[PDB]
Amino acid sequence: FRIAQDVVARENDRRASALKEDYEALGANLARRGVDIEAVTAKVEKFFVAVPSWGVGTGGTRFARFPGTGEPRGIFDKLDDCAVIQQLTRATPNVSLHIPWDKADPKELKARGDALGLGFDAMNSNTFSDAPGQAHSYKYGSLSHTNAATRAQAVEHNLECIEIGKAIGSKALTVWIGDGSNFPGQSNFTRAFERYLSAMAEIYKGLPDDWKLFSEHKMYEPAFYSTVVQDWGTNYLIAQTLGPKAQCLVDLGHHAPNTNIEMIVARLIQFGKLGGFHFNDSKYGDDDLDAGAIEPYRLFLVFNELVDAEARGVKGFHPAHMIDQSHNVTDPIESLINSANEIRRAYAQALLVDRAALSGYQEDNDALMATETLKRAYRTDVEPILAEARRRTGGAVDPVATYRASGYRARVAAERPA
Amino acid sequence: FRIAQDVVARENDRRASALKEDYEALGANLARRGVDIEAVTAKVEKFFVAVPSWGVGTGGTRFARFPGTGEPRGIFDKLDDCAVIQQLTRATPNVSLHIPWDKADPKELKARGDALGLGFDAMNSNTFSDAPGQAHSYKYGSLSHTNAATRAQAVEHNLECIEIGKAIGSKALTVWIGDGSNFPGQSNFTRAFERYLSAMAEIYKGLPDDWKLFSEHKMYEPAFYSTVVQDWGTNYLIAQTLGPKAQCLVDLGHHAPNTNIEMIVARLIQFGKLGGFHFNDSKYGDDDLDAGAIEPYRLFLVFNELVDAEARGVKGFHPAHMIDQSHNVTDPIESLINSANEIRRAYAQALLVDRAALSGYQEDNDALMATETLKRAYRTDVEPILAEARRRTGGAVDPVATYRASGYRARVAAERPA
Amino acid sequence: FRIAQDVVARENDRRASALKEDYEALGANLARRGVDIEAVTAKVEKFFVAVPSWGVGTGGTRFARFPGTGEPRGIFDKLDDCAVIQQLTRATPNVSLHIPWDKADPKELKARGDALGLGFDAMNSNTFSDAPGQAHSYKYGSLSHTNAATRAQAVEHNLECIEIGKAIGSKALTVWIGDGSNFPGQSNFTRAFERYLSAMAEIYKGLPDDWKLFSEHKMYEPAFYSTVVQDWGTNYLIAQTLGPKAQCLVDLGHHAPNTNIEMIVARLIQFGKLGGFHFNDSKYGDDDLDAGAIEPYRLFLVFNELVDAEARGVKGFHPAHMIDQSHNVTDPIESLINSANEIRRAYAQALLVDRAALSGYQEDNDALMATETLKRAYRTDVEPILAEARRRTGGAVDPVATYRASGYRARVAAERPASV
Amino acid sequence: FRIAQDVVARENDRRASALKEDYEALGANLARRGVDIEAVTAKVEKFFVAVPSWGVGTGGTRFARFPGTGEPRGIFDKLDDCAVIQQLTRATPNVSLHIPWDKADPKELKARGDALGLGFDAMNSNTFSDAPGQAHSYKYGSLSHTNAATRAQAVEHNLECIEIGKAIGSKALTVWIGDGSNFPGQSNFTRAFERYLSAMAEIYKGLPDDWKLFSEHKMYEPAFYSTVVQDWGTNYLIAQTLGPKAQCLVDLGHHAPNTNIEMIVARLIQFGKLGGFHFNDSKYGDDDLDAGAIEPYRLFLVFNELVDAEARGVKGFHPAHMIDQSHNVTDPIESLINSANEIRRAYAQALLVDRAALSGYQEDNDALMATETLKRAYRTDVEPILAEARRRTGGAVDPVATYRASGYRARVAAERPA
């Protein structure tokens, strides 16, 4: 165990009394509202979100990167750190890998994962940067590059990601590329998209039937004029064109200012193309900040659509959940811990919505009560439920407090080169 | 003739020598660039854009409306004013009607149009406002309203618009509604969209074999939280679901901040669902300003996509263009005149792009020369072409100057009581 | 009383048990956090926000207006409705008037206000629309219009607003105009601003010693290319130029997409130019939606800056608080009630922030714990505190539910003629 | 001469005939508008904009950097490339240095500059990144950092920049920092600003009597929640607080979506705090794209304000203009060349505005004719003037064409490492 069990027990005992008081109080409040707190905690204990291997190390901007102490070197150190997040929150049993950054012996990866109590989520291909010894540069694109050999190289790389994923237990390939243009006229919009579609079709041919192929849209960056997979509309066309196993991945920070993202989620669900989510928060662009740190209500509204879907009985609805963030000014482990917590927080609150009451207010066009019905759920402080779920499943009542009391950061700082 | 022919002749002849000088100078320049000015002028003469009947009246905001003199009241006054725009620019032969604002005896409407030299473009339904004696209010929606009777009333109204259009020569119905919500939870996104699709399917059934049904997306306003037909993504789902006769209308000012609109145009063209483009300009929201008055280059880039499709062929490409603006601080006739001019200006410049050279630079990923190739066309002052095209077709060399010299505004001001 | 006391009493009794349980539970939780819930409730029950007279009637857009039943006939009906909001929430004792919309004999306005237990907040001038009989139109501007006589007309109107306010107990004038341009070149940015500053100085000259002049910036609408008072930068230049009695009014929905509004608030406070707030919520533009219905955290963050001002010891800081919203698809009274509630909600949460802990995390650059410190306050459900504050002050535990139980809307619907 | 004079001559003679024709044609056109093309050309030959030393190297994003061949290594290589831009465009005689990147013997820099025919513009400090051996990290800020020792280090660095500038002929220091926060609560907005103002006051004390101190605002990036110097309002407070020698720098891509940037320019000029303008273009955020490649009209409108200032007779107005761009997918030298050209293009068009006619239309509130007055200037293709201006001053008629014909890139690619 990355974190000593005695430290976990000690820090849980220190806060056990208060938690009992808060949990029983919330339990009584919920019972008065016709909700069984135990039913909610039971569901919360089953909600999982994948952590990004590339998010365990300190992130940076084009201006600078300010690493902290004990930075993980390689995927093995990263898995060790991810193990801490799972142990304390119990909400991140799976890790999402990025190739070639995390390329290593599949048997070893799988072996280390099993030892750490971690599984592997969707693989992530990388054709938005050049690796050492690469034959063709992705400077002007990859899967949609004008040069056939470059597209071929990109397709092969993606197929390799599938091979690695199959060996470790992954069940999906997420494809996000920077392909686009920085100048009007640089790219022929339609021809570029045609090349992309043809390349993805080749990747789709190599996709196992138990896998999903996720395409991720993004309005801009690295391309600053146009992007091939720029929004959910183009993304839908891609998924629909490719096949039943192809779906769209929605990253919260990849939309134009003021976009109603939760509606995008609902539309994709209605047409069976909501592959999964990339959680994070933002205020200006693709800021990649800790989930819920900027607009917690928006996060709740997205989950409201997810919970409504299940309520409406949508079949085969098992969207993938992943955190896609960059931690530039905090301890990556702490941020991922609290981000995973915020995701479960939004989910739990969405579970509290009185669906029957809401349905009634929507049908009668009682906008005020309809919105207040959502607010009654959102305003509820579900921390006691989150903390109890962790406590009952081997985690920490207060993950960050236990993390800091363990001295893990100082430990790995002493074991890893500065 | 709304404007005395002798006035047009007079104003044109005084400027004839100057125009000839500019036309010949530009011709020599285009000749050196391997372009035949005559070929461009010929195409410009045949580019038309519909004028909205409601556009000749002074517009306003929710804060106030400041009418000018001689305001047209009713469709008859409006057609009289629209006739001026066509006579002077020769780029707006067809008018788009709005029901019930323009309700009148179909035979009278058609007779008046024929007399003024005006045809009728797409009909526009109105279920975003309540008419006197209306059985059900559209306060909470229309085609997507939760009340079955309300949706039925909206459907019948649209069918009635088709019946009126059939009687006057129209071949399409444009559907733009305000349907949406101002509060989270007020509407169930998916159910509202399902209701909308079901209602539109009924309207689709009353569509003659040679008619088209256009759905128009808008991010927000009048709904300030969510809008059923909020973007081109939803618009595409609508058109594809309804059938071959259903297409999407792209209104420039209806997109989120920083949206790459020309790409949306390309995407719709590729999948055969670009029903038409609604021209106007904007800086903040759906400002409905004179086309090209704010971002003339963006207008050119949209036309670059239209000309590429117009030239390279492309199946199902028969866009029905219309100007959709609000004139709050100018003479509506003058603004529509210059907006129509600006639209032809961007078209003309798009026709100057060296397609072969551009394609070459795109294939070689020569971004700088690709963008410069577009700029060489855009930087060209094609006013001489626009003016000569008008002169050859019965219009005015300088439309606004001629309009002012005619004293038309003062004339209608004396005929119409403020 | 607009709302029968027996109804308020009955609806309060019906919910007494649940409130006791929730309030006492919250109180114990706060105590464990070193917070005295009684101290918080005591401050909450004293937080007031002015209600707009123009907000009690149903609003609309340029596309349409869909009135409900019992729409107020004039200012007197509007005051009657504002009295309902105050009686039930006890958070809106003052009303903001708009001239000429609310023109009437000052003596009578004051008399009705006194009778209903309502006071009057800042006056609001109107030179963004033309009233009957004006010598000059405001189509191309007002205080910054190129025509000298038009600017003078606008100044005199504002001076008249001050006279009305003086007679009814108001102590400030808020100036928001639509002045700007829809086309590049239409206006000379600098000349228009110079004209505006000059005119505003004459309005300032007419201010009593104890009055304030608030200028309100807005990025766009009605002007769609440029606006004379477009942002807080220009607004600061205005207030600083006019004098000590001139301050800036920040309306939440009047900023560019993604603007960090709470920072603007902090900057204005630092330089003593934060006159007050116009509360509302939005997602796209100046949506004028119910406060907190879209981004409740942003509202909390704005209040975090207001409370921090006190924590830093800023002297003579008494910003004016007003709700400026448009209720297009709800009963205006209910939206104003819940908006006032949402404002007290954010204020209450800001009061819960452990300022001592936050200062520490800020100094040592512990960003995660610093943000979590704000969240611990924001995540707290303070509804019990709000409800108790109302109970103690003669209000309703659940304002909207009580309003609906009273049948007030159906009553005024039968009393007021629908416009024809 | 970085570029062989024989090449410049040959490439000019090859295009001299066409240029003569277009120039005379434009001259006749302008004469009819009461404008002497020679007077315009004379002023254009005198318009200069500084080039960023760091702009000649290929830029990148946080995702990747795709360097081209012959990447400059060190300030001396960079000056060699800047010389090419100045030689061919004759519009960029001054270079802006960045410390510590361009640190070198002031005597040698000056000597190399004089030899290349280049001068030096404003110095640029760097406290948005950490350098080796640095005592205190700027991870959590610099001039506004909570740690006094860190702020002192930042101050000393800026003073060092002034000393270096005093030795090479610079007359200003530009200060742009990343200081800000990524999370609500992380920073106290007021305290952070107070710390910044106090640190800047110390830097101001190191300014010679004839120097300027420029502060540059930016809405976001690297800070994603709040930025100390976030907009022009805060920037004004800074300049007004520091003193007469402190002014504001307006970088085009550093504003919120839809911001009216030209108004900000006008406001700063009115209050004497417009230190200078940083040119570039953008569509989404701080894209740092080639000037005028996305919104050429906006660039023209900014120049309309700069030219109006002269027309109004504003005293002591000597703005320090510089190009601040990132060239990620083109040859840096070619982009800077066309960007400088675009800047002169906008300036020239601004000079064509009929100020008398414009003020007349502004006074009578003739919005349509006022905007058309600006458009008459903007629609004028001034390329012949720009080209002739270059030809007469030793530059190239077609800069990029000559640059490519010279083979400079391949040349330095062989002299420099990969």
Ligand SMILES: [Mn+2]
């Ligand atoms: Mn992602």
Ligand SMILES: [Mn+2]
């Ligand atoms: Mn991303």
Ligand SMILES: [Mn+2]
């Ligand atoms: Mn439209």
Ligand SMILES: [Mn+2]
């Ligand atoms: Mn519109």
Ligand SMILES: [Mn+2]
């Ligand atoms: Mn307001």
Ligand SMILES: [Mn+2]
């Ligand atoms: Mn407003």
Ligand SMILES: [Mn+2]
């Ligand atoms: Mn800059």
Ligand SMILES: [Mn+2]
């Ligand atoms: Mn920049």
